[PDB]
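Standup notes
- HV: blocked on the assembly model, inputs below
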Amino acid sequence: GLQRTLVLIKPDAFERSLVAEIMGRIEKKNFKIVSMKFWSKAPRNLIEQHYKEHSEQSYFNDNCDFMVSGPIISIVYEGTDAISKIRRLQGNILTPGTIRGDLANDIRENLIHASDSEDSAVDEISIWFPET
Amino acid sequence: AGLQRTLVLIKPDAFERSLVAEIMGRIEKKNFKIVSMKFWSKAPRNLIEQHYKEHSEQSYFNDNCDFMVSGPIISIVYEGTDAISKIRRLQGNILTPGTIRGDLANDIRENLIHASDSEDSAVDEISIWFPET
Amino acid sequence: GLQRTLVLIKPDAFERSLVAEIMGRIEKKNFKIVSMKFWSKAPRNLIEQHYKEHSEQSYFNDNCDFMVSGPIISIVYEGTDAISKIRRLQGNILTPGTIRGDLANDIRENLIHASDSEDSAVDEISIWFPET
Amino acid sequence: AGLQRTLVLIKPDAFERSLVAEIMGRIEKKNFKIVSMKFWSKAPRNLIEQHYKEHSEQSYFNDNCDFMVSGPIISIVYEGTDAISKIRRLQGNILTPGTIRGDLANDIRENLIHASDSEDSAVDEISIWFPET
Amino acid sequence: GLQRTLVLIKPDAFERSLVAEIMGRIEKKNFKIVSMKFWSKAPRNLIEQHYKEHSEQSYFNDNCDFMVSGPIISIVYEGTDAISKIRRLQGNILTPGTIRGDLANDIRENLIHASDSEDSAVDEISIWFPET
Amino acid sequence: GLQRTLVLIKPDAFERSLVAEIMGRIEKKNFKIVSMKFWSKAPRNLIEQHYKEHSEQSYFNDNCDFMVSGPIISIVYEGTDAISKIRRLQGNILTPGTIRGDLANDIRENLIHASDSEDSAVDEISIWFPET
Ligand SMILES: Nc1nc2c(ncn2[C@@H]2O[C@H](COP(=O)(O)OP(=O)(O)O)[C@@H](O)[C@H]2O)c(=O)[nH]1
Ligand SMILES: Nc1nc2c(ncn2[C@@H]2O[C@H](COP(=O)(O)OP(=O)(O)O)[C@@H](O)[C@H]2O)c(=O)[nH]1
Ligand SMILES: Nc1nc2c(ncn2[C@@H]2O[C@H](COP(=O)(O)OP(=O)(O)O)[C@@H](O)[C@H]2O)c(=O)[nH]1
Ligand SMILES: Nc1nc2c(ncn2[C@@H]2O[C@H](COP(=O)(O)OP(=O)(O)O)[C@@H](O)[C@H]2O)c(=O)[nH]1
Ligand SMILES: Nc1nc2c(ncn2[C@@H]2O[C@H](COP(=O)(O)OP(=O)(O)O)[C@@H](O)[C@H]2O)c(=O)[nH]1
Ligand SMILES: Nc1nc2c(ncn2[C@@H]2O[C@H](COP(=O)(O)OP(=O)(O)O)[C@@H](O)[C@H]2O)c(=O)[nH]1
Ligand SMILES: [Mg+2]
Ligand SMILES: [Mg+2]
Ligand SMILES: [Mg+2]
Ligand SMILES: [Mg+2]
Ligand SMILES: [Mg+2]
Ligand SMILES: [Mg+2]
């Protein structure tokens, strides 16, 4: 049934003026905003916590640098099967119809993050909205 | 050559959410034409039960009928090349972005649109909603 | 407060695949469909009744011919101040932002009709939906 | 040169009607940038009353406050050339197609968006919603 | 009143990925492309001729610089009352519903040029499409 | 993996006023125009070369006729993995989310051509843009 998931809108969305386009796609599939924060520049520690699973990868530092290179928005969305459904909406740069498939063409500059599972959603919401 | 007609229902949730034109527009943009169309402020329960006759022994049957009479519906006959399968693909499902249900719906009952799933289904459904053959 | 008005979607809208675009503009301003009929070809008598105020004008017959040259949809819309508001949405070919202003460029092939007053709305609804 | 900041509220009716992104998108497309933004599941009555202080003696004051706390709101500070008047023009009114209110609203209370109407108003409203100057 | 007019899509439209959005607004109003050229970087001389009337203004040189700062597209559009109608579609940064009204917020970076009169359209078409 | 690919916008796109819609989908995926030509009516020889591989098929002549039945635009697009990505964007009439999937419903009148491989892109670019 009802789930909550964490979405980040990435600095490339701001640079390319695609913020509303992305949020609109999620809004049109009937998901609701439960919490939202705007960061002119996200604190690097939050970014590093968010991507901690990748801390050993060669791209870790470079990806973190990208993620602090402009604003981000962190959003908690709520709706039926929200985690999987918003993950599907995000898609990938190979899949037309999805956010990444229609709008992105890079492995790193890919516009949006959505939690990939129940456990990561719980964790990511606590990173960005520790108040709850 | 491959011209067909199919039956589409715009469901009550489309009216509630103001997505009627959005749904019709996706079909229009794929080059399918309206042949017949009726607006129902409330569809007769009898038509709904015949439409979903194949589901009559399913647990969800009565609740789905209740939903389908909870608000207006539009019944439309569309015409074009391979209309039945093409409009079914346009309809899609709530798991497939790019489709009507995939982009716009998030429930397996409140899913905005019905489209006939076969030549047999289309003949039958068109007869139900547009008996004036 | 609440009013009802009559809209015709004209044959040029069908020809140019702008039916949903036009209906969408009205739907987005929060007006509701109360009645609707699709005519593969409108009976000429209905068209002549609809435009009876113009029966003496030089363009009368030609306009009627246009209006039976393809399908039309007749719709009764309901909402606050519906008559004036939908009239404003229709606009004219000189006014960007409006249906005619954005999408039409002809005196006759202008996509949509909307009732111009309380009296004509009453009359036009009775022409297209005599049942009520 | 002519850079300004202005305060925008996305009202509860925008959430009810799923028009939040549509409204924000129109401002984004005009090349204005978000400087600050807060989501309120329910805005404090006190902030709403200060925001509409100039209307406090009007007959519609209490009802408008009730509406403004009936659902979520988003408060946003936008920045750009001539932002105050430009975003006010984007806001428009329910009589003017091409604008947010003109295209999307049909009520003088439930009208989707507020934008500051002057430099004085903007300073005051930004202070109310983003006191952390 | 069939007419032809000259449109430039400016470098800011390319920078902001608004080329199709702009062309679409003209397309939806039923104006037809008669000829079109893409310039990765327009020859400065063409720009100087195009804005010749402004050669005495203080902004001339800076405006020319902007106009060669990225690609442009030059288009001849044809349709009824095309000069006036496409001029109106262009609008200004103060008028929502128009191209500049919805999309631009600068006096120089304003996305599109459209001929403002019969004489200037003739002149501008001769500049960008001399083969004519 | 920066690449260039050749796109044709076909006469049905002009007939149906879908030119900007099609170009917009490619623009939104962040691909850049490198060169572009508008043909009021393409020289038949260019069309015959373009579809040379089909010269033995029964549909060759009729397809060529269609391709000169109205204007076309020839475009060289540049971007990461452009050939494959724009090919995927084109899609087919069975796959919603793609250009053909959302907008076309015919085997011949299918709105757009995009190069299907490295070799064909090289070849097709040489046909429409020999100056290259
Ligand atoms: N292989 C590779 N991947 C990268 C690089 N930079 C960023 N990424 C990807 O960026 C992603 C960041 O995670 P997330 O925001 O959830 O995007 P997602 O994992 O693709 O859904 C990781 O999956 C990385 O694979 C890079 O240099 N190389
Ligand atoms: N599994 C399941 N399906 C339901 C329920 N309520 C409604 N439905 C489905 O809602 C659908 C209505 O959409 P329809 O027009 O028939 O197209 P379809 O969903 O692709 O078959 C039916 O297929 C029903 O199976 C339910 O409680 N459970
Ligand atoms: N002057 C003129 N007007 C025409 C001609 N053909 C159609 N029209 C216009 O078409 C309109 C039909 O009325 P309606 O559907 O309500 O459009 P509207 O009156 O412009 O809002 C009339 O107002 C006529 O002025 C023509 O040949 N000459
Ligand atoms: N005249 C009138 N106005 C109302 C009523 N209820 C709410 N409003 C208006 O709703 C508006 C709220 O929008 P606001 O953010 O202030 O922008 P504005 O409408 O342009 O002033 C206020 O201006 C109020 O005047 C009412 O009953 N009567
Ligand atoms: N006043 C002023 N004008 C400028 C500036 N930069 C460019 N312009 C002019 O603004 C015009 C841009 O619009 P244009 O394409 O000519 O169409 P127009 O707005 O109808 O004149 C150009 O003629 C430029 O020369 C500036 O900084 N100040
Ligand atoms: N089987 C078949 N093919 C056709 C017909 N008409 C055109 N075609 C071919 O369909 C192709 C149109 O798509 P194209 O631009 O080549 O890209 P493609 O779909 O990947 O091959 C052309 O190569 C035409 O020669 C037809 O009636 N039948
Ligand atoms: Mg992710
Ligand atoms: Mg179905
Ligand atoms: Mg009228
Ligand atoms: Mg206001
Ligand atoms: Mg100009
Ligand atoms: Mg191809």
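- HV (later): unblocked. The longest helix of chain B spans residues 119-129. Chain B has seven helices and four strands.
- Next: hand off to the docking folks.
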